[PDB]
Design a protein around this nucleic acid. Structure first.
Ligand SMILES: [Mg+2]
Lengths: 48, 112, 43, 120
RNA sequence: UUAAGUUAUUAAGGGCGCACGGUGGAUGCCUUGGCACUAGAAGCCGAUGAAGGACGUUACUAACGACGAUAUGCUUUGGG
RNA sequence: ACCGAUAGUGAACAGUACCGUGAGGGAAAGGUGAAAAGCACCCCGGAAGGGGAGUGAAAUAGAACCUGAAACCGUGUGCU
RNA sequence: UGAGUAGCGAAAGACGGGUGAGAAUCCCGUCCACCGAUUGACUAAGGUUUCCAGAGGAAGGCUCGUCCGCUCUGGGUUAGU
RNA sequence: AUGAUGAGGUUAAUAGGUUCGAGGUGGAAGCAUGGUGACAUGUGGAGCUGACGAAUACUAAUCGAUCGAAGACUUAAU
Protein backbone atom coordinates (compact mmCIF):
# COMPACT_ATOMS: atom_id res chain seq x y z
CA UNK A 1 0.00 0.00 0.00
CA UNK A 2 2.62 2.62 0.91
CA UNK A 3 6.30 2.76 -0.07
CA UNK A 4 8.56 1.31 2.61
CA UNK A 5 11.65 3.32 1.63
CA UNK A 6 12.05 6.47 -0.41
CA UNK A 7 13.23 6.16 -4.00
CA UNK A 8 16.72 7.40 -4.77
CA UNK A 9 17.75 9.57 -7.71
CA UNK A 10 19.44 6.73 -9.57
CA UNK A 11 16.51 4.32 -9.37
CA UNK A 12 14.05 7.02 -10.39
CA UNK A 13 16.19 7.84 -13.40
CA UNK A 14 16.58 4.21 -14.39
CA UNK A 15 12.81 3.83 -14.40
CA UNK A 16 12.48 6.74 -16.85
CA UNK A 17 14.77 5.15 -19.46
CA UNK A 18 11.89 4.39 -21.83
CA UNK A 19 9.64 7.38 -20.97
CA UNK A 20 10.21 9.42 -24.13
CA UNK A 21 8.46 10.44 -27.35
CA UNK A 22 9.59 9.79 -30.90
CA UNK A 23 10.00 11.96 -34.00
CA UNK A 24 6.99 11.83 -36.37
CA UNK A 25 6.68 10.57 -39.93
CA UNK A 26 7.27 13.83 -41.77
CA UNK A 27 7.32 13.48 -45.52
CA UNK A 28 8.04 16.59 -47.57
CA UNK A 29 5.40 18.33 -49.68
CA UNK A 30 7.14 18.40 -53.07
CA UNK A 31 5.17 20.73 -55.32
CA UNK A 32 4.64 23.56 -52.85
CA UNK A 33 5.01 24.08 -49.15
CA UNK A 34 6.98 22.67 -46.24
CA UNK A 35 6.98 19.33 -44.45
CA UNK A 36 3.75 17.48 -43.73
CA UNK A 37 2.79 14.34 -41.90
CA UNK A 38 2.97 11.27 -44.10
CA UNK A 39 -0.25 9.88 -45.60
CA UNK A 40 -1.92 13.16 -44.66
CA UNK A 41 -3.14 16.04 -46.81
CA UNK A 42 -2.33 19.73 -46.37
CA UNK A 43 -4.73 21.58 -48.67
CA UNK A 44 -3.30 24.89 -47.47
CA UNK A 45 0.38 25.44 -46.65
CA UNK A 46 1.14 22.68 -49.13
CA UNK A 47 0.39 21.57 -52.64
CA UNK A 48 0.14 18.09 -51.16
CA UNK B 1 28.92 33.24 -33.07
CA UNK B 2 25.85 32.46 -30.98
CA UNK B 3 22.42 33.97 -30.48
CA UNK B 4 20.02 33.09 -27.69
CA UNK B 5 16.46 33.77 -26.58
CA UNK B 6 14.70 33.08 -23.28
CA UNK B 7 11.04 32.66 -22.34
CA UNK B 8 10.61 33.23 -18.62
CA UNK B 9 7.78 31.93 -16.41
CA UNK B 10 5.96 29.81 -18.93
CA UNK B 11 3.10 28.11 -17.15
CA UNK B 12 3.85 24.52 -18.15
CA UNK B 13 5.65 22.06 -15.90
CA UNK B 14 9.34 21.44 -16.73
CA UNK B 15 9.08 17.65 -16.88
CA UNK B 16 6.64 18.14 -19.76
CA UNK B 17 8.74 20.71 -21.62
CA UNK B 18 11.97 18.73 -21.47
CA UNK B 19 10.28 15.83 -23.21
CA UNK B 20 9.78 17.80 -26.43
CA UNK B 21 13.04 19.67 -25.96
CA UNK B 22 15.03 16.43 -26.15
CA UNK B 23 13.88 16.10 -29.77
CA UNK B 24 15.55 19.19 -31.22
CA UNK B 25 18.84 19.40 -29.34
CA UNK B 26 21.69 19.37 -31.83
CA UNK B 27 19.80 19.71 -35.12
CA UNK B 28 19.85 22.31 -37.83
CA UNK B 29 17.20 24.98 -37.57
CA UNK B 30 14.98 24.03 -40.51
CA UNK B 31 14.64 20.42 -39.37
CA UNK B 32 13.87 21.57 -35.83
CA UNK B 33 11.13 23.87 -37.11
CA UNK B 34 9.70 20.94 -39.05
CA UNK B 35 9.73 18.68 -35.99
CA UNK B 36 8.00 21.26 -33.79
CA UNK B 37 5.15 21.74 -36.27
CA UNK B 38 4.24 18.05 -36.37
CA UNK B 39 4.62 17.05 -32.73
CA UNK B 40 1.32 17.36 -30.89
CA UNK B 41 2.30 18.12 -27.31
CA UNK B 42 1.13 21.25 -25.53
CA UNK B 43 4.56 22.88 -25.40
CA UNK B 44 5.39 22.64 -29.12
CA UNK B 45 4.09 26.11 -30.13
CA UNK B 46 5.79 27.86 -27.17
CA UNK B 47 9.15 26.26 -27.91
CA UNK B 48 8.66 27.12 -31.56
CA UNK B 49 8.20 30.78 -30.74
CA UNK B 50 11.38 30.76 -28.65
CA UNK B 51 13.32 29.15 -31.51
CA UNK B 52 11.96 31.68 -34.01
CA UNK B 53 12.98 34.52 -31.72
CA UNK B 54 16.53 33.18 -31.47
CA UNK B 55 16.75 32.84 -35.25
CA UNK B 56 15.62 36.45 -35.66
CA UNK B 57 18.19 37.67 -33.14
CA UNK B 58 20.89 35.73 -34.99
CA UNK B 59 20.10 37.64 -38.16
CA UNK B 60 19.22 41.17 -37.05
CA UNK B 61 21.88 41.70 -34.37
CA UNK B 62 24.79 39.53 -35.51
CA UNK B 63 24.32 39.36 -39.30
CA UNK B 64 24.41 35.57 -39.48
CA UNK B 65 23.09 33.53 -42.38
CA UNK B 66 20.10 31.55 -41.17
CA UNK B 67 20.53 28.89 -43.86
CA UNK B 68 23.27 27.09 -41.91
CA UNK B 69 22.50 27.25 -38.19
CA UNK B 70 22.20 24.48 -35.63
CA UNK B 71 20.42 24.35 -32.29
CA UNK B 72 23.45 24.27 -30.03
CA UNK B 73 21.72 24.24 -26.64
CA UNK B 74 18.14 23.75 -25.50
CA UNK B 75 17.10 23.43 -21.88
CA UNK B 76 14.38 24.23 -19.37
CA UNK B 77 14.88 25.46 -15.81
CA UNK B 78 12.34 25.67 -13.01
CA UNK B 79 10.48 28.85 -12.23
CA UNK B 80 8.50 29.77 -9.13
CA UNK B 81 5.55 27.56 -8.18
CA UNK B 82 1.97 28.65 -7.54
CA UNK B 83 0.53 26.80 -4.56
CA UNK B 84 -3.13 25.77 -4.54
CA UNK B 85 -5.46 23.35 -2.78
CA UNK B 86 -8.21 20.89 -3.58
CA UNK B 87 -10.87 19.84 -1.07
CA UNK B 88 -10.93 16.10 -0.48
CA UNK B 89 -13.36 13.92 1.42
CA UNK B 90 -14.18 14.41 5.12
CA UNK B 91 -13.09 18.02 5.45
CA UNK B 92 -9.49 17.62 4.28
CA UNK B 93 -7.50 19.63 1.75
CA UNK B 94 -4.66 18.44 -0.49
CA UNK B 95 -1.94 20.53 -2.09
CA UNK B 96 -1.61 21.26 -5.80
CA UNK B 97 1.52 22.69 -7.46
CA UNK B 98 1.09 24.74 -10.62
CA UNK B 99 4.67 24.73 -11.88
CA UNK B 100 6.37 27.08 -14.36
CA UNK B 101 9.47 26.99 -16.60
CA UNK B 102 12.24 29.14 -18.05
CA UNK B 103 13.07 28.03 -21.61
CA UNK B 104 16.37 28.83 -23.36
CA UNK B 105 17.42 28.20 -26.97
CA UNK B 106 20.79 29.21 -28.42
CA UNK B 107 21.75 28.74 -32.08
CA UNK B 108 25.21 28.91 -33.62
CA UNK B 109 26.92 28.62 -36.98
CA UNK B 110 29.90 26.63 -35.69
CA UNK B 111 32.73 29.05 -36.50
CA UNK B 112 34.89 31.68 -34.84
CA UNK C 1 -28.25 17.09 6.04
CA UNK C 2 -29.41 20.06 8.08
CA UNK C 3 -26.48 21.97 9.53
CA UNK C 4 -26.22 24.17 12.56
CA UNK C 5 -26.25 27.92 11.90
CA UNK C 6 -29.47 28.80 10.18
CA UNK C 7 -29.05 32.58 9.86
CA UNK C 8 -31.69 35.10 10.93
CA UNK C 9 -31.38 38.89 11.00
CA UNK C 10 -33.68 39.51 13.98
CA UNK C 11 -32.34 36.73 16.20
CA UNK C 12 -28.79 37.96 15.62
CA UNK C 13 -29.52 41.55 16.62
CA UNK C 14 -31.56 40.52 19.63
CA UNK C 15 -29.24 37.98 21.21
CA UNK C 16 -26.00 39.74 20.30
CA UNK C 17 -26.04 43.34 19.51
CA UNK C 18 -25.45 46.60 21.28
CA UNK C 19 -28.62 47.25 23.27
CA UNK C 20 -28.71 43.68 24.56
CA UNK C 21 -25.11 43.85 25.74
CA UNK C 22 -25.80 47.21 27.40
CA UNK C 23 -28.84 45.86 29.25
CA UNK C 24 -26.78 43.88 31.80
CA UNK C 25 -23.65 44.29 33.89
CA UNK C 26 -21.87 41.30 32.37
CA UNK C 27 -22.63 42.61 28.90
CA UNK C 28 -21.05 45.93 29.74
CA UNK C 29 -18.06 43.89 30.89
CA UNK C 30 -17.83 42.34 27.41
CA UNK C 31 -18.02 45.74 25.74
CA UNK C 32 -15.29 47.21 27.95
CA UNK C 33 -13.11 44.14 27.45
CA UNK C 34 -13.35 44.52 23.67
CA UNK C 35 -12.62 48.24 23.89
CA UNK C 36 -9.46 47.60 25.90
CA UNK C 37 -8.16 45.11 23.35
CA UNK C 38 -8.70 47.68 20.60
CA UNK C 39 -11.12 45.46 18.70
CA UNK C 40 -12.71 47.16 15.71
CA UNK C 41 -16.15 45.52 15.97
CA UNK C 42 -18.02 45.66 19.28
CA UNK C 43 -21.10 43.49 18.86
CA UNK D 1 -18.61 -3.44 -36.79
CA UNK D 2 -17.47 -0.95 -34.19
CA UNK D 3 -18.98 0.70 -31.14
CA UNK D 4 -18.25 4.40 -31.13
CA UNK D 5 -18.32 4.90 -27.38
CA UNK D 6 -22.12 5.00 -27.37
CA UNK D 7 -25.07 2.76 -26.59
CA UNK D 8 -26.98 0.93 -29.28
CA UNK D 9 -29.56 3.69 -29.78
CA UNK D 10 -27.22 6.66 -29.43
CA UNK D 11 -24.96 5.07 -32.04
CA UNK D 12 -27.79 4.45 -34.49
CA UNK D 13 -29.05 7.98 -33.94
CA UNK D 14 -25.84 9.86 -34.64
CA UNK D 15 -25.13 7.63 -37.59
CA UNK D 16 -28.33 8.66 -39.40
CA UNK D 17 -27.47 12.27 -38.56
CA UNK D 18 -23.97 11.87 -39.97
CA UNK D 19 -25.31 10.24 -43.12
CA UNK D 20 -27.92 12.97 -43.64
CA UNK D 21 -25.57 15.94 -43.36
CA UNK D 22 -23.14 14.34 -45.81
CA UNK D 23 -25.88 14.25 -48.45
CA UNK D 24 -26.69 17.93 -47.78
CA UNK D 25 -23.16 19.30 -47.86
CA UNK D 26 -21.32 16.72 -50.04
CA UNK D 27 -18.30 17.11 -47.74
CA UNK D 28 -17.94 17.00 -43.96
CA UNK D 29 -15.19 16.97 -41.34
CA UNK D 30 -15.21 14.48 -38.47
CA UNK D 31 -13.02 11.99 -36.61
CA UNK D 32 -11.57 8.95 -38.37
CA UNK D 33 -13.39 6.09 -36.67
CA UNK D 34 -16.71 7.80 -37.34
CA UNK D 35 -15.85 8.36 -40.99
CA UNK D 36 -14.94 4.72 -41.47
CA UNK D 37 -18.39 3.75 -40.18
CA UNK D 38 -20.54 6.29 -42.02
CA UNK D 39 -18.72 5.30 -45.21
CA UNK D 40 -20.76 2.09 -45.51
CA UNK D 41 -24.02 3.68 -44.35
CA UNK D 42 -24.01 6.35 -47.05
CA UNK D 43 -23.23 3.97 -49.92
CA UNK D 44 -26.17 1.70 -49.14
CA UNK D 45 -28.38 4.78 -49.29
CA UNK D 46 -26.98 5.59 -52.73
CA UNK D 47 -27.61 2.01 -53.81
CA UNK D 48 -31.24 2.35 -52.73
CA UNK D 49 -31.40 5.59 -54.68
CA UNK D 50 -30.14 4.05 -57.91
CA UNK D 51 -32.95 1.47 -57.85
CA UNK D 52 -35.56 4.20 -57.85
CA UNK D 53 -38.79 2.30 -57.23
CA UNK D 54 -41.34 3.10 -54.55
CA UNK D 55 -40.41 0.14 -52.36
CA UNK D 56 -36.85 1.43 -52.08
CA UNK D 57 -37.78 5.07 -51.64
CA UNK D 58 -39.64 3.91 -48.55
CA UNK D 59 -36.69 1.90 -47.29
CA UNK D 60 -34.47 4.96 -47.61
CA UNK D 61 -36.91 6.95 -45.47
CA UNK D 62 -36.08 4.78 -42.47
CA UNK D 63 -32.64 6.41 -42.44
CA UNK D 64 -32.03 9.85 -43.88
CA UNK D 65 -33.57 11.98 -41.19
CA UNK D 66 -35.68 14.96 -42.36
CA UNK D 67 -34.39 18.32 -43.62
CA UNK D 68 -35.09 21.01 -46.19
CA UNK D 69 -32.43 22.27 -48.55
CA UNK D 70 -32.62 25.72 -50.10
CA UNK D 71 -30.72 25.68 -53.38
CA UNK D 72 -30.24 28.60 -55.76
CA UNK D 73 -33.33 29.90 -57.57
CA UNK D 74 -35.18 29.34 -54.28
CA UNK D 75 -35.74 25.61 -54.80
CA UNK D 76 -36.72 23.84 -51.60
CA UNK D 77 -36.41 20.07 -51.60
CA UNK D 78 -36.00 17.44 -48.93
CA UNK D 79 -32.93 15.28 -48.45
CA UNK D 80 -34.79 12.23 -49.72
CA UNK D 81 -35.65 14.14 -52.87
CA UNK D 82 -32.11 15.39 -53.47
CA UNK D 83 -30.74 11.87 -53.10
CA UNK D 84 -33.12 10.18 -55.55
CA UNK D 85 -32.93 13.20 -57.81
CA UNK D 86 -29.35 14.16 -58.47
CA UNK D 87 -27.14 11.97 -56.32
CA UNK D 88 -28.46 8.87 -58.05
CA UNK D 89 -28.17 10.26 -61.57
CA UNK D 90 -24.59 11.33 -60.86
CA UNK D 91 -23.25 7.87 -60.01
CA UNK D 92 -25.47 6.02 -62.44
CA UNK D 93 -22.53 4.01 -63.81
CA UNK D 94 -19.98 3.62 -60.98
CA UNK D 95 -20.45 0.13 -59.47
CA UNK D 96 -19.50 1.11 -55.93
CA UNK D 97 -17.20 3.69 -54.47
CA UNK D 98 -19.02 7.02 -54.11
CA UNK D 99 -16.92 8.23 -51.15
CA UNK D 100 -13.31 8.91 -50.23
CA UNK D 101 -11.56 9.74 -46.96
CA UNK D 102 -8.67 12.19 -46.55
CA UNK D 103 -6.66 12.39 -43.34
CA UNK D 104 -5.62 15.59 -41.60
CA UNK D 105 -3.64 16.31 -38.48
CA UNK D 106 -4.58 15.82 -34.85
CA UNK D 107 -7.11 18.15 -33.28
CA UNK D 108 -5.96 20.55 -30.59
CA UNK D 109 -8.29 19.97 -27.64
CA UNK D 110 -7.92 16.22 -27.64
CA UNK D 111 -5.54 14.15 -29.68
CA UNK D 112 -8.21 13.11 -32.15
CA UNK D 113 -7.27 12.31 -35.74
CA UNK D 114 -9.32 14.61 -37.96
CA UNK D 115 -10.60 13.57 -41.37
CA UNK D 116 -12.53 14.86 -44.39
CA UNK D 117 -15.02 12.44 -45.93
CA UNK D 118 -16.21 13.59 -49.33
CA UNK D 119 -18.60 12.34 -52.00
CA UNK D 120 -16.72 11.45 -55.18
C1' U E 1 42.66 -22.38 -46.07
C1' U E 2 41.12 -25.08 -42.15
C1' A E 3 41.74 -26.16 -36.84
C1' A E 4 42.83 -24.93 -31.53
C1' G E 5 43.46 -20.73 -28.30
C1' U E 6 43.79 -15.82 -26.17
C1' U E 7 42.16 -11.05 -25.97
C1' A E 8 39.75 -6.49 -28.08
C1' U E 9 35.29 -3.20 -29.56
C1' U E 10 28.91 -1.17 -27.82
C1' A E 11 26.36 2.69 -23.49
C1' A E 12 19.77 2.11 -23.97
C1' G E 13 20.76 3.91 -19.38
C1' G E 14 23.76 4.29 -14.61
C1' G E 15 28.33 5.73 -11.15
C1' C E 16 32.40 9.22 -9.58
C1' G E 17 35.14 13.92 -10.47
C1' C E 18 34.95 18.77 -12.73
C1' A E 19 32.54 23.29 -15.22
C1' C E 20 28.22 26.21 -15.92
C1' G E 21 22.98 27.41 -14.80
C1' G E 22 18.03 27.60 -12.01
C1' U E 23 15.14 27.29 -7.55
C1' G E 24 15.29 29.00 -2.43
C1' G E 25 16.00 32.70 1.16
C1' A E 26 20.22 30.94 5.37
C1' U E 27 24.72 34.12 6.53
C1' G E 28 27.08 39.14 6.92
C1' C E 29 26.26 44.32 7.16
C1' C E 30 22.05 47.94 8.29
C1' U E 31 17.55 50.36 11.09
C1' U E 32 12.46 53.03 10.55
C1' G E 33 10.57 49.55 15.79
C1' G E 34 10.91 47.61 20.53
C1' C E 35 12.94 46.34 26.03
C1' A E 36 14.78 47.75 30.97
C1' C E 37 15.63 52.03 33.79
C1' U E 38 17.09 57.27 36.01
C1' A E 39 15.70 62.53 37.05
C1' G E 40 11.65 66.20 37.12
C1' A E 41 6.30 67.28 36.43
C1' A E 42 1.68 65.02 36.90
C1' G E 43 -2.33 61.30 37.75
C1' C E 44 -9.81 61.30 37.41
C1' C E 45 -12.94 62.92 32.75
C1' G E 46 -18.64 63.61 32.73
C1' A E 47 -25.93 66.41 32.20
C1' U E 48 -21.87 73.36 30.14
C1' G E 49 -23.26 65.87 27.55
C1' A E 50 -17.74 61.90 28.83
C1' A E 51 -14.61 57.42 27.24
C1' G E 52 -15.42 55.13 22.63
C1' G E 53 -17.59 55.28 17.95
C1' A E 54 -20.88 56.06 13.13
C1' C E 55 -21.25 59.11 9.13
C1' G E 56 -19.17 62.97 6.43
C1' U E 57 -15.35 67.07 4.67
C1' U E 58 -9.90 68.00 -0.62
C1' A E 59 -10.77 69.91 -8.08
C1' C E 60 -9.97 64.70 -9.33
C1' U E 61 -10.95 59.96 -3.54
C1' A E 62 -10.06 53.86 -1.78
C1' A E 63 -7.33 53.62 3.29
C1' C E 64 -4.83 56.12 7.58
C1' G E 65 -3.86 60.87 9.84
C1' A E 66 -6.25 65.98 10.54
C1' C E 67 -10.97 68.50 10.80
C1' G E 68 -17.04 68.95 11.72
C1' A E 69 -22.37 71.66 7.30
C1' U E 70 -17.61 77.88 9.29
C1' A E 71 -15.52 70.43 7.83
C1' U E 72 -8.13 68.30 4.27
C1' G E 73 -10.27 74.09 8.38
C1' C E 74 -12.04 80.12 10.62
C1' U E 75 -10.20 84.57 13.95
C1' U E 76 -6.50 86.82 17.03
C1' U E 77 -1.82 87.62 19.86
C1' G E 78 3.53 86.24 19.51
C1' G E 79 7.58 83.64 16.67
C1' G E 80 9.74 82.94 11.68
C1' A F 1 29.70 45.30 28.61
C1' C F 2 19.71 45.56 26.18
C1' C F 3 17.37 43.03 20.74
C1' G F 4 18.74 43.79 15.50
C1' A F 5 13.51 41.22 11.29
C1' U F 6 12.29 32.95 13.39
C1' A F 7 15.22 38.37 17.56
C1' G F 8 12.91 42.74 20.07
C1' U F 9 6.03 44.18 21.67
C1' G F 10 1.07 39.82 19.11
C1' A F 11 2.22 44.15 15.85
C1' A F 12 9.53 48.11 12.39
C1' C F 13 4.91 47.03 6.89
C1' A F 14 -2.21 44.63 13.28
C1' G F 15 -5.82 43.40 17.62
C1' U F 16 -5.90 43.80 10.80
C1' A F 17 -6.29 38.66 6.90
C1' C F 18 -8.60 34.80 8.79
C1' C F 19 -11.37 31.27 12.28
C1' G F 20 -15.85 30.93 15.65
C1' U F 21 -23.57 31.64 16.65
C1' G F 22 -21.07 33.90 20.74
C1' A F 23 -17.68 34.91 24.81
C1' G F 24 -13.12 34.47 22.36
C1' G F 25 -8.50 33.04 19.38
C1' G F 26 -5.15 35.36 16.25
C1' A F 27 -1.02 35.52 11.77
C1' A F 28 2.48 36.18 7.48
C1' A F 29 4.90 40.22 5.56
C1' G F 30 11.90 45.43 6.26
C1' G F 31 16.74 46.56 2.40
C1' U F 32 17.30 49.20 -6.22
C1' G F 33 20.80 53.31 -6.55
C1' A F 34 24.80 58.53 -4.23
C1' A F 35 21.06 60.52 -7.42
C1' A F 36 15.09 57.75 -10.81
C1' A F 37 19.22 59.25 -14.04
C1' G F 38 13.16 53.50 -13.47
C1' C F 39 15.81 51.23 -20.04
C1' A F 40 14.37 56.90 -25.98
C1' C F 41 14.80 53.94 -30.47
C1' C F 42 15.29 48.94 -33.55
C1' C F 43 14.08 43.55 -33.99
C1' C F 44 11.00 38.38 -32.95
C1' G F 45 6.16 37.90 -30.66
C1' G F 46 -1.48 38.63 -30.12
C1' A F 47 0.67 39.46 -25.48
C1' A F 48 3.92 37.83 -21.70
C1' G F 49 8.92 37.41 -22.18
C1' G F 50 13.51 38.27 -24.75
C1' G F 51 18.22 40.22 -27.98
C1' G F 52 20.56 44.60 -29.04
C1' A F 53 21.15 50.05 -28.08
C1' G F 54 21.30 53.54 -24.07
C1' U F 55 21.68 55.28 -18.16
C1' G F 56 24.93 54.10 -14.26
C1' A F 57 31.12 53.02 -10.88
C1' A F 58 28.22 48.44 -11.28
C1' A F 59 21.89 46.08 -14.73
C1' U F 60 24.18 37.96 -13.29
C1' A F 61 22.04 46.63 -8.94
C1' G F 62 15.78 46.26 -13.83
C1' A F 63 11.47 46.85 -9.17
C1' A F 64 9.83 38.83 -7.57
C1' C F 65 15.57 44.69 -7.32
C1' C F 66 22.00 44.55 -1.10
C1' U F 67 24.79 39.85 -0.02
C1' G F 68 22.66 35.20 -2.18
C1' A F 69 24.41 29.04 1.70
C1' A F 70 22.01 24.02 1.61
C1' A F 71 18.28 20.58 0.22
C1' C F 72 16.28 19.95 -4.86
C1' C F 73 16.13 20.31 -10.59
C1' G F 74 18.99 20.48 -15.21
C1' U F 75 22.95 20.93 -19.60
C1' G F 76 28.17 19.57 -21.18
C1' U F 77 32.03 16.59 -20.38
C1' G F 78 37.68 13.28 -18.14
C1' C F 79 37.66 8.02 -16.09
C1' U F 80 34.28 3.75 -15.59
C1' U G 1 9.55 10.68 -2.96
C1' G G 2 5.27 7.90 -4.20
C1' A G 3 4.49 9.68 -10.26
C1' G G 4 3.47 11.61 -15.23
C1' U G 5 0.61 7.62 -10.98
C1' A G 6 -5.09 8.13 -8.48
C1' G G 7 -8.78 11.49 -9.71
C1' C G 8 -11.20 15.32 -13.20
C1' G G 9 -18.36 15.21 -8.79
C1' A G 10 -24.88 11.13 -11.66
C1' A G 11 -26.84 12.47 -18.00
C1' A G 12 -26.72 12.70 -25.71
C1' G G 13 -25.19 14.76 -28.92
C1' A G 14 -24.02 15.62 -34.52
C1' C G 15 -22.86 18.72 -38.52
C1' G G 16 -22.80 23.58 -41.27
C1' G G 17 -21.64 28.88 -40.97
C1' G G 18 -18.92 32.86 -38.12
C1' U G 19 -15.16 35.20 -35.20
C1' G G 20 -10.15 34.82 -33.82
C1' A G 21 -2.81 34.47 -33.18
C1' G G 22 -5.11 30.08 -31.43
C1' A G 23 -11.78 26.57 -31.28
C1' A G 24 -14.46 19.38 -29.21
C1' U G 25 -15.44 23.53 -25.34
C1' C G 26 -17.60 31.02 -27.58
C1' C G 27 -21.85 32.98 -31.10
C1' C G 28 -25.81 31.75 -35.00
C1' G G 29 -28.71 27.75 -37.75
C1' U G 30 -30.87 22.85 -38.57
C1' C G 31 -31.64 18.02 -36.82
C1' C G 32 -31.61 14.79 -32.50
C1' A G 33 -32.32 13.84 -27.29
C1' C G 34 -33.98 14.75 -21.51
C1' C G 35 -37.75 16.86 -17.55
C1' G G 36 -42.87 18.07 -17.64
C1' A G 37 -47.40 17.21 -9.46
C1' U G 38 -41.82 19.50 -12.96
C1' U G 39 -35.14 20.27 -14.51
C1' G G 40 -41.76 24.84 -15.74
C1' A G 41 -44.03 29.71 -13.49
C1' C G 42 -44.79 32.94 -8.76
C1' U G 43 -43.99 34.74 -3.29
C1' A G 44 -41.04 34.28 1.67
C1' A G 45 -36.35 33.62 4.54
C1' G G 46 -31.14 34.15 3.69
C1' G G 47 -27.22 36.47 0.71
C1' U G 48 -25.74 41.68 -0.35
C1' U G 49 -24.25 44.32 -6.22
C1' U G 50 -23.49 38.67 -7.85
C1' C G 51 -27.90 42.79 -11.97
C1' C G 52 -26.79 45.86 -17.38
C1' A G 53 -23.34 47.70 -21.43
C1' G G 54 -18.45 48.19 -23.48
C1' A G 55 -13.39 46.38 -22.97
C1' G G 56 -9.92 42.04 -21.04
C1' G G 57 -7.67 37.11 -20.66
C1' A G 58 -2.09 37.05 -15.51
C1' A G 59 -4.64 34.40 -11.51
C1' G G 60 -9.98 31.68 -10.45
C1' G G 61 -13.00 27.82 -13.78
C1' C G 62 -10.82 20.27 -11.76
C1' U G 63 -9.41 20.32 -19.59
C1' C G 64 -9.72 24.52 -23.19
C1' G G 65 -11.48 29.33 -23.62
C1' U G 66 -12.00 34.38 -28.26
C1' C G 67 -16.27 32.93 -22.74
C1' C G 68 -17.88 33.93 -17.48
C1' G G 69 -21.42 34.60 -11.14
C1' C G 70 -13.61 36.40 -12.63
C1' U G 71 -10.53 41.69 -13.85
C1' C G 72 -11.24 47.17 -15.68
C1' U G 73 -14.49 51.45 -16.87
C1' G G 74 -19.29 53.45 -16.79
C1' G G 75 -24.41 52.65 -15.44
C1' G G 76 -29.11 50.60 -13.12
C1' U G 77 -33.91 50.05 -8.07
C1' U G 78 -39.26 55.99 -9.10
C1' A G 79 -45.64 54.20 -5.00
C1' G G 80 -51.71 58.50 -1.08
C1' U G 81 -53.81 52.61 -2.89
C1' A H 1 -4.31 -4.41 -22.75
C1' U H 2 0.06 -1.80 -25.21
C1' G H 3 3.79 -3.43 -27.63
C1' A H 4 4.67 -8.20 -30.03
C1' U H 5 2.75 -12.02 -33.88
C1' G H 6 0.63 -12.97 -38.70
C1' A H 7 -2.06 -11.36 -43.79
C1' G H 8 -1.18 -7.01 -47.49
C1' G H 9 0.83 -2.03 -49.57
C1' U H 10 -0.78 -0.77 -57.29
C1' U H 11 4.10 -5.56 -60.90
C1' A H 12 -1.96 -5.16 -55.51
C1' A H 13 -7.81 -9.08 -53.61
C1' U H 14 -5.47 -6.04 -47.45
C1' A H 15 -10.08 -3.56 -45.78
C1' G H 16 -14.62 -4.22 -48.88
C1' G H 17 -18.45 -0.69 -51.71
C1' U H 18 -20.74 -3.48 -55.84
C1' U H 19 -22.56 -8.46 -57.95
C1' C H 20 -23.67 -13.60 -56.86
C1' G H 21 -24.34 -17.28 -53.10
C1' A H 22 -24.71 -20.13 -48.08
C1' G H 23 -27.42 -19.66 -43.69
C1' G H 24 -31.70 -16.90 -40.95
C1' U H 25 -36.66 -15.36 -40.99
C1' G H 26 -41.32 -16.85 -43.09
C1' G H 27 -44.81 -14.78 -47.46
C1' A H 28 -42.74 -7.26 -48.35
C1' A H 29 -44.76 -2.92 -50.72
C1' G H 30 -48.12 -1.74 -54.60
C1' C H 31 -52.15 -3.50 -57.26
C1' A H 32 -56.25 -6.91 -58.21
C1' U H 33 -60.22 -10.25 -56.45
C1' G H 34 -63.84 -12.13 -52.34
C1' G H 35 -66.29 -10.35 -47.92
C1' U H 36 -71.27 -5.65 -44.79
C1' G H 37 -66.68 -5.72 -41.72
C1' A H 38 -62.59 -7.42 -38.76
C1' C H 39 -59.84 -9.92 -42.61
C1' A H 40 -58.60 -13.79 -46.66
C1' U H 41 -56.48 -15.29 -51.35
C1' G H 42 -53.26 -14.17 -55.91
C1' U H 43 -49.18 -11.80 -58.20
C1' G H 44 -44.67 -14.93 -55.57
C1' G H 45 -40.68 -20.00 -50.89
C1' A H 46 -42.04 -13.30 -51.78
C1' G H 47 -39.13 -9.48 -49.43
C1' C H 48 -35.30 -8.30 -46.19
C1' U H 49 -30.70 -9.84 -44.32
C1' G H 50 -24.06 -8.09 -38.96
C1' A H 51 -19.83 -10.95 -38.57
C1' C H 52 -19.55 -16.79 -43.22
C1' G H 53 -17.84 -18.41 -49.20
C1' A H 54 -16.67 -16.39 -54.17
C1' A H 55 -15.91 -12.68 -58.11
C1' U H 56 -14.77 -7.57 -59.35
C1' A H 57 -9.56 -2.19 -58.76
C1' C H 58 -15.08 1.60 -58.13
C1' U H 59 -12.72 3.97 -52.86
C1' A H 60 -8.30 3.83 -49.78
C1' A H 61 -3.31 1.09 -48.88
C1' U H 62 0.60 8.02 -52.66
C1' C H 63 5.19 10.31 -53.03
C1' G H 64 9.15 9.25 -49.55
C1' A H 65 12.67 8.84 -45.33
C1' U H 66 15.79 6.24 -41.80
C1' C H 67 18.94 2.22 -40.13
C1' G H 68 22.37 -1.39 -41.80
C1' A H 69 29.02 -5.11 -43.09
C1' A H 70 33.80 -4.52 -44.77
C1' G H 71 36.16 -10.88 -41.75
C1' A H 72 41.78 -8.83 -35.59
C1' C H 73 46.08 -11.52 -33.29
C1' U H 74 49.22 -16.28 -31.67
C1' U H 75 50.47 -21.32 -32.62
C1' A H 76 50.22 -26.02 -35.34
C1' A H 77 48.98 -28.85 -39.72
C1' U H 78 48.15 -27.54 -44.94
MG1 LIG I 1 19.13 16.85 -11.43
Amino acid sequence: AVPKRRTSKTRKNKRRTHFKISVPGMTECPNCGEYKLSHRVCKNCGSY
Amino acid sequence: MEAKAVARTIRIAPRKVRLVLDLIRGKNAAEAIAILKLTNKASSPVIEKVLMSALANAEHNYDMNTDELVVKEAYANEGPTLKRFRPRAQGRASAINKRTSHITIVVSDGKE
Amino acid sequence: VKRTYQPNKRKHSKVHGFRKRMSTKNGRKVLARRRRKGRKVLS
Amino acid sequence: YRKLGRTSDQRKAMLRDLATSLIISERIETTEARAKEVRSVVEKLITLGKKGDLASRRNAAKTLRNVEILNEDETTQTALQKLFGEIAERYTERQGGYTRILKQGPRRGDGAESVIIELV
